[PDB]
Design a protein around this ligand. Structure first.
Ligand code: ADP
Ligand code: ADP
Ligand code: MG
Ligand code: MG
Lengths: 95, 262, 134, 259, 136, 259, 262, 107, 128, 135, 105, 96
């Protein structure tokens, strides 16, 4: 499953990033990000490409308020997928 | 840590046979190269792995129960982890190329319309077909059909990417393109890849386990570098292509004295 | 999977021929006998009637090699069993121009194999003209 | 034989019996699943584009030709009896009984019967059948049963438009060209059987012809060798096998409910 | 095209129903108490025989009843409910349509209601008794 | 619409005007050379093998299925006029004039008409049409003229066998199953029409159908796209174009020497 | 001492050209190797030499008169000297394999019946098909169709044998067969050979003149040894298989920022 | 051309069908719309259709149902003697049947 | 021999030869009657059983209501007297009716005629 | 092959010749001086009408024509030259084959080329046959 | 079927055609082989084919033509009162055009 | 471009050129061409072809049955270069 928790302005994800868990976090994702300054997560096992769309869909509706979102604490698996599909550096931290 | 093991599967036809007591193992993280000339099975061995046809006696195990002797509903859930491609191009001509890559992950998993467009478009950059996502698939190039089938091959969870005879006849501007796609998918995901290309210089530079076999019997089960030097005139014919050797090269039916006198 | 696709082909072929076996149908009957002198224009499978309703059919009509008289083999179905021996047969014509049909006029009990003595033959057109004009 | 002259039962006799069994399992494994009304609703409209309306090109031009050849031939030997007022007994009655669903089913095996055999054959040469089977979905309920349920809905709807164009086409030579009647042709069919055994026999033999034509054309495409020569022999076999399925099956139906 | 096929299929389905109403309303055919009527000679009556009064058809025949003792047939007719004023003095005969046509019921016109048996009837005459009585 | 809605004459109208003449240019270049009687003598017999005797299986079994279904239907309305001895007026006259060379000519396009376009199309797919024109001579007068000279004698050798199997098949149900007469069947056809205006028309309406049927089957196989998709389009189009060549040309033949 | 002198031709079919100012020369005694990727003209160049299709405006000769527009009777007498083969195999399946090799010399020259059997059975040893003279050609192997087309190609007296795409996809057992058959015919008959196989780990070892071209314009006209080392990033994509280079390799979309968001 | 309707009451109409032709002296002058019945007397009330080309037809016209051929259907004979929108012809004559004419000839 | 333009004009010349095969496929008198029976248009007239012409149309009299028919006689036969009677005869037993001019000893009328006799009142007049 | 197809076209050509003789010899009939007469009522005569003497067919007729002076139907008929012993006293009668049939010349026995047979018997019409039954 | 031939002479054969069913008592016993004529008096000399099961036929038998159809079809009936015999007691057929002359006059 | 032959005793010197154009006057005359000829020499030909090499083996089966041995000298190197191409085993060519 996929779980969501704010803990201030972090928006930590504790549930497993699967391909059938993007259905509950789709109608409430507009109110999910509220002034998040640093995305941090350490309780996932693997990352799928079908679940990789949420990390790219959280950038456009959060940058229009006038605040930047930093992305740290992730594994190197998302950076090997960054070069695999040539993800742009304007929406990626490139670490 | 093997994935699929074949234990002496024959698949005997109505008058002849294809395999005679073969032994095949696939390791986790390596590239399995199944090579051989015409006379043995190349594309009919992988159809026994998926379970589309019924084989002869013998056991083939995809790390668990038997594949071709299980139920129907269980077989559709284990075969989705392979998602192999085809040689001629497994692309539907009735729909667009945007729906050809999307056709697996539309009916398998549940994605809404803004979420589905963000998953099928990002898969086309690894094969180089993101700009070619709004044209008709009625016309392509010599190597563009294999890139579109590979972009939809990894839409599901990949475990056994069986490359159904890649780059068997192609131009050298894509020969260094598709063999790079073997190395990219095997290294980034850590999944296994099975290539059945019989061209000796290209597949042996990226594979770690070669399987040379002839006269419907397995004879070589070593690595890609330990099979070049061995004292037997059976596997040096396939590696170093010459005219004579184990082949008769005459096709004899007489003595060349009974004919052409009258 | 060789024998699996063989045994199923015998079952579909036997089921297809089962509907085509019994098709020329569209009965423990007792046979009758009658001796006329001139039948007329009767043919095979002609229905016999008692009062307009069909009661049976005629199997065949064989000639006698001794008296040279026509013998017709008419049949009666499972009903119409209670009939006296004083009946009479008379060949009639259905309508004005249709085919001929045997008619039983209601007059022991005729069993399986009994014949009828009272018979009435047909009237040819050549006899009514010669009798009316002369 | 007797030693080597028994090849018509051991080799040729087993070849005919083997193809009858594969057609039985293809129909049995495709009509047992529950069809989804919300999923197959944009699927059946696409299947009627190359079956229903694509075969309507030969109906609107040759459907008037069936009524025009019978109108002229119902005048050569009719003047000896002066039966010109009964032209509805010779044109309308002789069209819905055994001329309608036999000619229209023979033309269905050339436009729709030959295209449905080649469409499965080209996808097996390009290996599009097993690509659906690989992921999860059986092809018997994806590319077969929409092509099977559209055949039993096209041919009953193709024959009811075939009987109307020949009746109107019979009037072009019945009251317009010849001019023997004005209203007597339309009243000659008024004394016939409307709905007892005439129009219902135009429906029970058309939906049987819709089954036996679409069963062989879908099986010959499924049992075709995926080469360039295999898809050409299957397109020639689906016409000669359906010709014995229309003319051979007609003999056992005129002995049922027809006197 | 997923739009051009819809406007060509939809004009094809309406062509199947306008061809269906042309053979239904413009054809021969598109609340009836029954009586009992014994007979002596049927001749040529069959199922759905037209029952008529004054030449115009008024009813049909459902089935046929037979007698196992006197061997007299009983025609089961069906008069429509619009006419319920048939007297008891009216008889029933079986006449032929023209000279070579089919045979039909011709009633030559207490109130007859449902569950009654007509006793006064003189059906027809056969051709064999027509020539046999004229000459002899 | 007027600025861009004129594509039916500027683009589509020129396309239909090009296919009607390319079949006329190829046959004009194939009927001008003198044929060799000593060289084509083992060549014309090979073309009669895949056309003549390979189309004979749909005649020996389906030939009795045309005459028997009229024998059952020659009893429903014929008994009302008491013309059971006049069965020869519907079993002999209606099997060669408007029915003989119009069903066998349509069945010619299913077995020996649809395989001819597959013959030239398979050789063009295997690069055999261009392999012949560079060695000795262009194949317009080498492999097409045996296919055309055996194509003109194909229906007058199939129509005379088709009219006798319907007479012999029709007599198996008229005098055997029904059993109404034994000598009135063969004598009713003697007082009918004879060699004056119809059997001289059968030999001239069957050869004009053998030209127009073989004109399209040898054109779609020679003029096609050399791929796996072009051979499937030629087999589907040779039936609907020949269906308008026998069912569209019998109307102008019935309006000639028939009153 | 050339064989065919071709100049700038385009051959635009309906909208696009296949060539753009090409030039080629064929020497007597050497093997002309004309390679190229998929998209530019390889096979249709050989058809323009024979003159079957009508070309565009251009000056092409055969050491004498014009090839495609000279006459009708004398054109068939000069086109029979080529006698080329094809890729899929120009073998008539309606006849025997004894007649497919005996086809182009039966009516060309006057030979008696016992003399015809003595000249049609000797050529079958040169490709190894001596027993392939009494069976149907309906079934073959992957490389037997190319040898039977070569046995009938030497029936006439040729001066150029135009090999139409040999061993484009084959096993290395038979790919190593036709690499020596080019040299044995050149060292004995002394004629020219045109190979158009677009793979060079074995073509440059036997050929002497390579023709590498790109973007439908000729760029390389050197020998088989002086083309491997040259400072230009245009012909190096054909020599060794790499990912990047002059090829586009990616086919980029419009903006790469706002797409796949909704 | 605007056809006016009429009415006629008989006792036995015989073998009349729909769309039957009416005739004045052997020539067809119109058709028959429908055949109705009376619920109290049970008599065949048939309506007629006569065109506007002939209007001065008296009400004493003897309507006799004749047969069309010799053994087929029947038709109407408007035998004029010496009518408007919605009138009834008084002089009516019924048709015949074969079974009733032979009863008077025999007895 | 061109490729595209030489093949156009040969298509109409084969089409014009097909439409030409499907395209083509006296002095009057007056004679009134009382009961014409079942005669219609295109009815053959005769002079005693052999066809000499047909009729044009059938009209009526708008004041006295009797059938008056017209008929056509070919110009090869002219000597017809004024006492020539005209009866309505039938061809065979079931065939259609026709007109037969009984010859005795343009625009001329026939005085003596004979109307068709319907057999519905002949059997009634035979008994009554 | 070049000999197996010769046998299959051998049995195919004789099957067409056997089917050809089945319709013109068994189904239909076997196919391999004039006189003058004047009638008064020919009825429904036409061309190619069979003339009969005794009850069998002996020939057909040439045409039916007329006279612009006498206005009587003159018929031209021809018979076989073997049947020339028919006497001149022979009434030509136009009868029908049964009740419903074609009108044929039914000659009875009681000639030269162009002999005008004067004694004839015209066909019967139904307008005076039922008139003589009543009157 | 083994049959034996007979002969009979009439005056007017009527509408008797080839293969006409001869009968006795309404049951067919054979067919008519051929219809011939006389070269001088022109009389129809018919031949008959009677099966071997019916042999007891006296020489006093009478032959008369009866009608079996309204299209001209007639049939012979042998009325009982070897090889190559001729029956002398015959009766000719009736003509509808001739029998009406006796009733009128 | 003609094919002529000169016996000159026991040589059978083919003076004309050897090709595939004309072969008829040397085909049916081979029964009287060699009877007991023991040596074959030729030095006036232009070139040999694949249709002409069948004639060199056709003069062996009727020559060895008479009781004589035939040698072949003075020929060019073109018949020895094509000796390995057709795999001619024995009694066809001296291989000198
Ligand atoms: N269904 C079949 N019908 C006929 N032959 C078959 C079939 N399946 C396999 N074969 C034969 O078995 C051999 C196995 O070769 P394979 O490796 O399948 O070739 P490819 O890789 O080209 O498909 C082939 O040569 C083929 O002829
Ligand atoms: N006659 C033609 N019809 C259609 N397309 C053609 C024709 N000739 C050439 N082409 C196109 O031109 C291109 C040239 O490629 P080419 O080198 O001829 O390919 P190949 O070597 O496989 O024949 C091909 O892709 C082909 O599609
Ligand atoms: Mg394969
Ligand atoms: Mg090519």
């Amino acid at each position: 499953s996929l779980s969501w928790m704010q803990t201030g302005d972090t928006l930590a994800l504790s549930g497993e990033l699967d391909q059938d868990v993007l259905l509950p976090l789709w109608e409430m994702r507009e109110e999910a990000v509220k002034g998040i300054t640093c995305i941090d997560l350490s309780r996932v096992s693997r990352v799928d490409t079908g679940g990789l769309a949420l990390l790219l869909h959280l950038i456009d509706l959060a940058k229009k308020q006038g605040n930047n979102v930093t992305l740290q604490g992730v594994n190197d698996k998302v950076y090997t997928l960054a070069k695999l599909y040539n993800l742009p550096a304007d929406v990626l931290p490139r670490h | 840590a093997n994935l699929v093991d074949m234990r002496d599967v024959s698949f005997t036809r109505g008058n002849r046979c294809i395999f005679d007591n073969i032994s095949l193992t696939v390791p986790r993280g390596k590239i399995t190269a199944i090579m051989g000339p015409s006379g043995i099975g190349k594309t009919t061995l992988l159809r026994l792995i998926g379970g589309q046809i019924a084989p002869d006696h013998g056991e083939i195990l995809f790390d668990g129960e038997n594949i071709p002797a299980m139920s129907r509903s269980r077989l559709y859930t284990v075969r989705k982890r392979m998602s192999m491609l085809f040689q001629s191009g497994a692309l539907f001509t009735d729909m667009n190329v945007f729906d050809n890559v999307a056709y697996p992950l539309r009916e398998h998993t549940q994605l809404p319309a803004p979420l589905l467009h963000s998953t099928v478009m990002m898969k086309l950059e690894a094969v180089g077909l993101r700009g070619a996502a709004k044209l008709m698939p009625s016309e392509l190039s010599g190597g563009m059909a294999r890139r579109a089938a590979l972009a939809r091959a990894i839409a599901l969870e990949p475990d056994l990417i069986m490359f159904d005879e890649p780059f068997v006849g192609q131009d050298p501007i894509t020969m260094g393109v598709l063999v790079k796609l073997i190395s990219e998918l095997n290294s980034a995901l850590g999944v296994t890849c099975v290539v059945v290309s019989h061209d000796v210089p290209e597949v042996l530079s990226i594979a770690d386990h070669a399987w040379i076999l002839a006269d419907k019997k397995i004879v070589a089960h070593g690595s890609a570098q330990a099979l070049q030097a061995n004292p037997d005139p059976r596997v040096r014919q396939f590696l170093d292509g010459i005219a004579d050797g184990p082949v008769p090269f005459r096709y004899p039916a007489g003595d060349y004295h009974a004919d052409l006198l009258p | 999977t060789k024998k699996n696709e063989i045994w199923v082909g015998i079952f579909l072929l036997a089921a297809l021929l089962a509907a085509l076996f019994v098709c020329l149908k569209a009965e423990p009957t007792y046979t009758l006998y009658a001796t006329f002198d001139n039948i007329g224009g009767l043919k095979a499978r002609s229905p016999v009637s008692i009062g307009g309703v069909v009661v049976g059919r005629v199997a065949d009509i064989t000639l006698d090699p001794k008296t040279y008289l026509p013998r017709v083999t008419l049949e009666i179905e499972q009903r119409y069993n209670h009939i006296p021996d004083t009946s009479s047969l008379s060949i009639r014509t259905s309508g004005l121009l249709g085919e001929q049909y045997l008619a039983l006029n209601v007059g022991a009990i005729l069993k399986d194999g009994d014949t009828i003595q009272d018979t009435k033959s047909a009237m040819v057109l050549e006899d009514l003209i010669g009798q009316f004009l002369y | 034989m007797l030693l080597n002259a028994l090849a018509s039962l051991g080799h040729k006799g087993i070849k005919t019996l083997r193809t009858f069994g594969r057609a039985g399992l293809m129909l049995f494994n495709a009509l047992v699943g529950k069809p989804e009304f919300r999923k197959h609703a944009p699927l059946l409209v696409r299947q009627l584009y190359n079956v229903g309306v694509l075969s309507m090109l030969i109906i609107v031009v040759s459907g008037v030709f069936i009524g025009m050849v019978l109108g002229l031939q119902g005048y050569l030997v009719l003047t000896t009896y002066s039966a010109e007022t009964s032209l509805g007994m010779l044109v309308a009655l002789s069209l819905l009984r055994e001329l309608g669903p036999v000619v229209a089913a023979l033309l269905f095996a050339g436009r729709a019967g030959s295209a449905l055999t080649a469409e499965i054959g080209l996808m097996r040469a390009t290996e599009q059948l097993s690509s659906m089977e690989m992921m999860a979905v059986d092809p018997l309920r994806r590319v077969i049963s929409p092509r099977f349920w559209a055949g039993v809905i096209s041919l009953p709807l193709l024959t009811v438009i075939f009987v109307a164009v020949g009746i109107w086409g019979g009037s072009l030579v019945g009251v317009s060209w010849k001019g023997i009647d004005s209203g007597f042709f339309w009243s000659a069919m008024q004394n016939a059987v409307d709905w007892r055994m005439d129009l219902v026999n135009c429906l029970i033999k058309s939906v049987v012809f819709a089954i036996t034509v679409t069963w062989i054309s879908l099986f010959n495409g499924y049992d075709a060798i995926p080469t360039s020569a295999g898809i050409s022999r299957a397109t020639t076999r689906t016409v000669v096998h359906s010709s014995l399925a229309v003319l051979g099956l007609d003999f056992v139906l005129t002995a049922l409910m027809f006197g």
